[PDB]
PDB file of C-alpha atoms in Angstrom:
ATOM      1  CA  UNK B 110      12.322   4.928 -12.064  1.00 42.49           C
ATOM      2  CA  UNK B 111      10.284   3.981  -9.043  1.00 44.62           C
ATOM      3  CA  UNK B 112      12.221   1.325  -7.632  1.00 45.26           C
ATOM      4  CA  UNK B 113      10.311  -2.108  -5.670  1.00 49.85           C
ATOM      5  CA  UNK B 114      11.558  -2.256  -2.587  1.00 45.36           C
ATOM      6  CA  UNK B 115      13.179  -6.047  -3.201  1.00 45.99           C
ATOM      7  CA  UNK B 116      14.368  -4.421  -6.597  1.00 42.15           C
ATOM      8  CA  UNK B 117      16.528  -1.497  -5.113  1.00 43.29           C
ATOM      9  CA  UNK B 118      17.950  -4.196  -2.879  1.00 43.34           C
ATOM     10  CA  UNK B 119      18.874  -6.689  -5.431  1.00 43.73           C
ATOM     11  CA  UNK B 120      20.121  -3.712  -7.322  1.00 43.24           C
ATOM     12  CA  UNK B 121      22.278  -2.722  -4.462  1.00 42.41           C
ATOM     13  CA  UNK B 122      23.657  -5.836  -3.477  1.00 43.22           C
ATOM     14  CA  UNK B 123      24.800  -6.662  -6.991  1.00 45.46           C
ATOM     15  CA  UNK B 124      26.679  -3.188  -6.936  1.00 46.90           C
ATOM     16  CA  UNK B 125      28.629  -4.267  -4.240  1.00 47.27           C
ATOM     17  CA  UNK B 126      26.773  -2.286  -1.405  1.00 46.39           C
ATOM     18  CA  UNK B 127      25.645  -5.701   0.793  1.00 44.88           C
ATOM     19  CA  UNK B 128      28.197  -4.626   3.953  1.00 46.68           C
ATOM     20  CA  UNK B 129      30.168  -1.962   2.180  1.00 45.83           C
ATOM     21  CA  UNK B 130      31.852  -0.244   4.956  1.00 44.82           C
ATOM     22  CA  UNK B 131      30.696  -2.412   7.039  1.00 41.61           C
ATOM     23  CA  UNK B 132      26.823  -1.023   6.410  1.00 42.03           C
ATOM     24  CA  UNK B 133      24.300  -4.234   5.536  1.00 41.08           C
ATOM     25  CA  UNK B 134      22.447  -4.222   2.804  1.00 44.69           C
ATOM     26  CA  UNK B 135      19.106  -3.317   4.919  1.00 46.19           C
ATOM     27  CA  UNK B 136      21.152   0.368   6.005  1.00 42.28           C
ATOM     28  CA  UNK B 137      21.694   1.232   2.174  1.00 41.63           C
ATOM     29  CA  UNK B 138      18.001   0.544   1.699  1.00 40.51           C
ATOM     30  CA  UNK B 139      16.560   2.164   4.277  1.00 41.38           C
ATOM     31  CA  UNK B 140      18.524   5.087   3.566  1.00 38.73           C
ATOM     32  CA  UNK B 141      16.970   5.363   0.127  1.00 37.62           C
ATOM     33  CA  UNK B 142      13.398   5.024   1.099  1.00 38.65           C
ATOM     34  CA  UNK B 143      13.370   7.800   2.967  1.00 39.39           C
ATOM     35  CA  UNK B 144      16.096   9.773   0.443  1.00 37.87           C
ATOM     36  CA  UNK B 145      14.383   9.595  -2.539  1.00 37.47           C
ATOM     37  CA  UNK B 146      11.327   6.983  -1.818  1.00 37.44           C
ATOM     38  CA  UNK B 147      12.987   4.903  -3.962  1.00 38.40           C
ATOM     39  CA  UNK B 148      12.721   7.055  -6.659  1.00 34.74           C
ATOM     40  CA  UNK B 149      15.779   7.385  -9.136  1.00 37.56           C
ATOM     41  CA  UNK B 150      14.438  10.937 -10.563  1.00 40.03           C
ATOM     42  CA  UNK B 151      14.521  12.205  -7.086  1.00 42.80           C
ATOM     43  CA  UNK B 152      15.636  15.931  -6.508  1.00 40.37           C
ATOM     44  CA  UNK B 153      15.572  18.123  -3.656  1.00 41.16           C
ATOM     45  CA  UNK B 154      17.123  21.037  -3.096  1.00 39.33           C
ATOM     46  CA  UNK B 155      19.026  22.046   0.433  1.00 38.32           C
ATOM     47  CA  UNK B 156      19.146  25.676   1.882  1.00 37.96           C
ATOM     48  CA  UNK B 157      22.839  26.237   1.211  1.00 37.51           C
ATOM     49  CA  UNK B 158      21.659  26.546  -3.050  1.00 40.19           C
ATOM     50  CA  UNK B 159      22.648  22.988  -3.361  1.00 39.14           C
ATOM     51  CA  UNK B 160      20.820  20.021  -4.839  1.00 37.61           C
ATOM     52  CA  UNK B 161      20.470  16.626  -3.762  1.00 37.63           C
ATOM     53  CA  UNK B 162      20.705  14.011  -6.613  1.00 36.20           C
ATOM     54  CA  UNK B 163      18.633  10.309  -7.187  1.00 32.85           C
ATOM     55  CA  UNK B 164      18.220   7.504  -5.107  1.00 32.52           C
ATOM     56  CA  UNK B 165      20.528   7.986  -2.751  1.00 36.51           C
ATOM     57  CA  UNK B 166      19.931  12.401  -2.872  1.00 35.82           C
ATOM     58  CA  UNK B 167      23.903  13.134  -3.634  1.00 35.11           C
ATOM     59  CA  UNK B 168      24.491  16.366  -2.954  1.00 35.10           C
ATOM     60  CA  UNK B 169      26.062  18.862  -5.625  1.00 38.05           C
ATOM     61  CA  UNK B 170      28.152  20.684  -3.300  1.00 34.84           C
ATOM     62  CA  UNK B 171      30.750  18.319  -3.335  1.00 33.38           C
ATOM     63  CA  UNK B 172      29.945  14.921  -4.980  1.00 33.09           C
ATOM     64  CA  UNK B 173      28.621  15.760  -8.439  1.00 33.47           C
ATOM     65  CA  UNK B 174      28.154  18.958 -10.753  1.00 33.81           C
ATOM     66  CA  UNK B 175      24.836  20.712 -12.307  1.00 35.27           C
ATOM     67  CA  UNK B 176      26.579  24.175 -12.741  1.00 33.52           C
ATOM     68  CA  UNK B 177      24.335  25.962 -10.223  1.00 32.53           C
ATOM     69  CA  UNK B 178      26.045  25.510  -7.381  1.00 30.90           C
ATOM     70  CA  UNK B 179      29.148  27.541  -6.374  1.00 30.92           C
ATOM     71  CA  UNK B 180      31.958  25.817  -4.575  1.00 31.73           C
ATOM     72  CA  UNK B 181      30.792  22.585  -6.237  1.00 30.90           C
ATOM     73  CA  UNK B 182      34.232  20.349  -6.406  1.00 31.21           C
ATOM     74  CA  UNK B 183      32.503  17.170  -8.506  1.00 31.94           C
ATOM     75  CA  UNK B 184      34.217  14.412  -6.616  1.00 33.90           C
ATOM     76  CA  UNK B 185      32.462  11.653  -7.976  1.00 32.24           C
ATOM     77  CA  UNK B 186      33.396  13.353 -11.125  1.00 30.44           C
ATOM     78  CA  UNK B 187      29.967  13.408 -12.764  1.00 28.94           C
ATOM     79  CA  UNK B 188      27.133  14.949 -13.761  1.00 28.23           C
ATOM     80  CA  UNK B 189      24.066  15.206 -11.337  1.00 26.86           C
ATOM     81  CA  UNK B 190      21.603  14.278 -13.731  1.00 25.96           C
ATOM     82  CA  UNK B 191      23.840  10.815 -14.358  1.00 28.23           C
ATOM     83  CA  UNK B 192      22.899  10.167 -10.682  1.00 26.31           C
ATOM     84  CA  UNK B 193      18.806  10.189 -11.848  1.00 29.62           C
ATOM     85  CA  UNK B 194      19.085   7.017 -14.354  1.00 29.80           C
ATOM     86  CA  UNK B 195      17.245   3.845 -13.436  1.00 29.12           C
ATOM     87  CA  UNK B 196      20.516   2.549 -13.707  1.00 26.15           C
ATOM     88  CA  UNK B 197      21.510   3.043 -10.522  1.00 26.19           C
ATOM     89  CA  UNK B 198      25.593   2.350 -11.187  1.00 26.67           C
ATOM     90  CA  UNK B 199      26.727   6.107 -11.069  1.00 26.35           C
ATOM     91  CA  UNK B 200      24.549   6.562  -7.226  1.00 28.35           C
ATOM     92  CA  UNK B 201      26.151   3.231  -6.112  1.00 26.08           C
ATOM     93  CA  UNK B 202      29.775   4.997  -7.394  1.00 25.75           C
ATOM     94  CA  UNK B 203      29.438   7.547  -5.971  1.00 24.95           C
ATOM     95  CA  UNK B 204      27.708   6.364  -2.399  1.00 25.81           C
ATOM     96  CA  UNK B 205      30.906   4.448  -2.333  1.00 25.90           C
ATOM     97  CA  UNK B 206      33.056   7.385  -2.324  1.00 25.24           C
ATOM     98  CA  UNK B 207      30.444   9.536   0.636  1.00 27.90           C
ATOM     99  CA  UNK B 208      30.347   6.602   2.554  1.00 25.89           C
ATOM    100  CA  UNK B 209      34.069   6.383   2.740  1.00 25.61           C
ATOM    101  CA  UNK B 210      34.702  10.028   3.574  1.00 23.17           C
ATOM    102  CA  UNK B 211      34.635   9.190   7.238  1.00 20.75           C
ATOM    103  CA  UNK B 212      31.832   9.841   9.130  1.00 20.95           C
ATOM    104  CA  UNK B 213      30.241   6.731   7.340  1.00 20.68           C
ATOM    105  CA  UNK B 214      26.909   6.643   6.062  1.00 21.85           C
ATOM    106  CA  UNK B 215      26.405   9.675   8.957  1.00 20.60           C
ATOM    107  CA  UNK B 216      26.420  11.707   5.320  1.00 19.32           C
ATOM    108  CA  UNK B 217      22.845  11.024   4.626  1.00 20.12           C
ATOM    109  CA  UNK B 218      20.873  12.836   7.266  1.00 22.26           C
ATOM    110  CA  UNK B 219      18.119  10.628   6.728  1.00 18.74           C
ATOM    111  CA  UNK B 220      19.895   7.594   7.414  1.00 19.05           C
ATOM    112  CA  UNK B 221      21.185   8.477  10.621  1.00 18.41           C
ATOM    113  CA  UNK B 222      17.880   9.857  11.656  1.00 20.23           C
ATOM    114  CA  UNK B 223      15.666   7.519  10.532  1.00 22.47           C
ATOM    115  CA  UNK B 224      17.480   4.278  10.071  1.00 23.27           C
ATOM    116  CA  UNK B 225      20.654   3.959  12.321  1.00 20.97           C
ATOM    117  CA  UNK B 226      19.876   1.799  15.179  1.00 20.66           C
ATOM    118  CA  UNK B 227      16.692   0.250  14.284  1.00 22.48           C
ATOM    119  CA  UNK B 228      16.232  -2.899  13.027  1.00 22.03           C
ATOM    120  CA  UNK B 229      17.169  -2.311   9.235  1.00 27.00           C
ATOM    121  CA  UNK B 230      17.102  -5.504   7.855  1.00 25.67           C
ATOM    122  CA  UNK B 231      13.550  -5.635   8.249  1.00 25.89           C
ATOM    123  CA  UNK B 232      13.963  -3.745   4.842  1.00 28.44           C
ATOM    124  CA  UNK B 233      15.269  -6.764   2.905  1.00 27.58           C
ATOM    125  CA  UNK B 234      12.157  -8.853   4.339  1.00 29.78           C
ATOM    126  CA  UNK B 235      10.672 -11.367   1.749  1.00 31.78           C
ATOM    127  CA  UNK B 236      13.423 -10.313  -0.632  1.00 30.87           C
ATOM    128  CA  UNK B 237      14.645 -13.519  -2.937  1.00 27.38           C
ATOM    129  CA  UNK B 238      18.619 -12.181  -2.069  1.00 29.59           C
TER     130      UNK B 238
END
């Protein structure tokens, strides 16, 4: 599922991610268009052999398992296809857990290169929220 950019956010904040961690609603966003373009079946996969999962791109090293990727300790104890659903529950589950690992939202690379520090609410513009 391609997800509207008011509809990932509505999504989001009714998962509980609206200033999770202290990280508005626009960061968790912003960190998705440029993840997965908001695009549940996202999948890319890294250097190291691992994957990166969804809306959010979870990594299979150490958040969820697909079976191809040594070393892989399933934290979020899931599958990685469960993280490709429109329903976006098990990626908000998860992103709950990453987020909380310490260095923050820092996890995604994307976030913290392309949205921390600019003006991310800009991202929830025009949404009904």
């Amino acid at each position: 599922k391609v997800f509207g950019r008011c509809e990932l956010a509505a999504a989001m904040k009714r998962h509980g991610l609206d200033n999770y961690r202290g990280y508005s609603l626009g960061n968790w966003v912003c960190a998705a268009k440029f993840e997965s373009n908001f695009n549940t079946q996202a999948t890319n996969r890294n250097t190291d052999g691992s994957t990166d999962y969804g809306i959010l791109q979870i990594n299979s090293r150490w958040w969820c398992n697909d079976g191809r990727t040594p070393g892989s300790r399933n934290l979020c104890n899931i599958p990685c296809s469960a993280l490709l659903s429109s329903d976006i529950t098990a990626s908000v589950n998860c992103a709950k857990k990453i987020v909380s690992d310490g260095n923050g939202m820092n996890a995604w690379v994307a976030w913290r290169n392309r949205c921390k520090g600019t003006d991310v609410q800009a991202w929830i513009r025009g949404c009904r929220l």
